[PDB]
Structure 1
């Protein structure tokens, strides 16, 4: 149940500066007043991050997804290789109530969207649902920037999240905040690309500015400092500058 979108709204793929964002707790070990060196998948400091003002983007190894969303227009994500019934696919949705995680071989068309009538009920993303393996229901995740990290290692899918109010106009703020781990999934898929979902105002769709930022992850070494209470308060890249 979907229609081809004639009004292919343009989201220009701009480039901007990552600064010092993309720091997450790699383990579950308490530490205090210690400098710890660790080699893992991270977002390099002062990298070059893509900005969209929903095409297909490869997953690479990991994804850093940031959104200074207002009124929660972002809906969810689709993960898979071909996003068809021929390959197992994953779906994540976060509406007003409980969030839902689904693992099935759905049927996907060119423009899967949600829409909503102003009566607030509309869902026309996929057409048919095949074999379903994993079901999950949890609590809702949600001037306010939300950052997430998506990883898939050894058949385990890891989602890290962190939200924080903001006051800057457009660019990413030059602050530091670690991304505490949120959710793990014991599902092994060959995911290589992903999508995005929007809450279009079906009232004539009104969705032309979907602002978000996307970066990728590379394996390298960082040095992290733990405060007295065990929260990461500073990080330093290794292969950035001779001083590093």
Structure 2
């Protein structure tokens, strides 16, 4: 439903260790280029993780008020909170009840359902104050939680802009609630939304850092047999020729086990009967 081309985005640093102008490779998880993406809007249904999230918001809107990263929607499977109180990134980690559809002359405070069992409260500088475009990266294996974004005004209000851009380490968090599913957060004042959620999986990249230590290009080791060669000559531009790069075979399916003919006939059972 509402598939769009995942062109170029979905990058991040593995960590910040210094290397510049050097085509470097790791084994991490990244966005498959030229894949689908979930364009969801009036209606905000629940979404399973599905082994992948690359969130992207829309412009023309300061309406999105965080996320519902989810399991089941009441108070029984411990909790998050990510909002903005129009001045600060308010992160409660409080246990709020069944706000399956929380919404907000300032109308707010429907999401506040059960203020009990608060065990972290947070206030910092806000994530974001032709409009800035938010994109985010959302995962879990042994430790923490990311916040990775960059915001740029552009045209093409609904569809994904092309062009390649890095993402940045902002805000990193050891919380502790391993994930099934998710859902968004928005507001109202007294629901016509748009956003994107991607998918990443383990896949080798080759990364370009610039003359200054910043991402400007990357390639994928499974998109085509072309970049496979780029994945094994450690370079972008290869020369007219032929390059043995990798190998294949046929996987096994049945995995039979065959043994000699049966009935060597222990008379063990006669003493039981």
Is the TM value for this pair above 0.5? yes
Counterpart CA distance in 2 for 1:173 and 1:127 is: 38
CA displacement at 1:101 relative to structure 2: 1.1
Structure 2 residue aligned with 1:216: 199
Which stretch of the first structure deviates more once superposed, 218-227 or 50-59?
50-59
Write out per-residue CA displacement over residues 197-219 of structure 1, whole angstroms, 9 at most, x where no aligned residue.
212232xxxxx421111112211
Give the aligned partner of residue 82 of structure 1: 72
Secondary structure in 2 matching 1:243:
helix
What is the CA distance between 1:37 and its match in structure 2? 0.7
Query: In the alignment, what sits opposite 1:33?
Result: 21
Return the alpha-carbon distance in structure 1 between the equivalents of residues 99 and 17 of structure 2: 44
What residue number does 1:240 align with? Answer: 223
Structure 1 residue 107, shift from structure 2 partner: 0.7
Contact 2:59 2:153 in 1 (8 A): no
Partner of 1:227: 210
After TM superposition, the score normalised by the length of structure 2 is 0.76
1:47 is aligned, of 28, 35, 41, to: 35
Shift of 1:152: 2.6
Paired residues of 1:160 and 1:182 also in contact (CA < 8 A): yes
Q: 1:110-150, CA deviations, whole angstroms, 9 ceiling, x for partnerless residues?
A: 42222xxxx32421113213322222211111143221112
- RMSD of aligned alpha carbons: 1.7
Deviates more, 1:69-78 or 1:226-235: 69-78
Return 5+ residue gaps in structure 2 as ranges: 228-273
Alignment coverage as a number of residue pairs? 223
Relative to structure 1, is the Cα distance of residues 103 and 62 closer, same or farther in structure 2, using a 3 angstrom cutoff?
Answer: farther
Which is strand-richer, 1 or 2? 1
CA-CA distance at 1:62 after TM superposition? 4.1
Aligned partners of 1:148, 1:43: CA distance in 2, in Å?
A: 12
Max Rg structure? 2
Give the stretch that moved more between structures: 143-152 or 217-226. Answer: 143-152
Note if contact 2:54-2:197 (Cα within 8 Å) is conserved in structure 1: yes
Specify every segment of 5 or more residues in structure 1 that has no aligned partner in the other structure, as ranges. Answer: 1-12, 203-207
d(CA) in 2 for partners of 1:95, 1:74 = 11
Deviation, structure 1 residue 27: 0.7
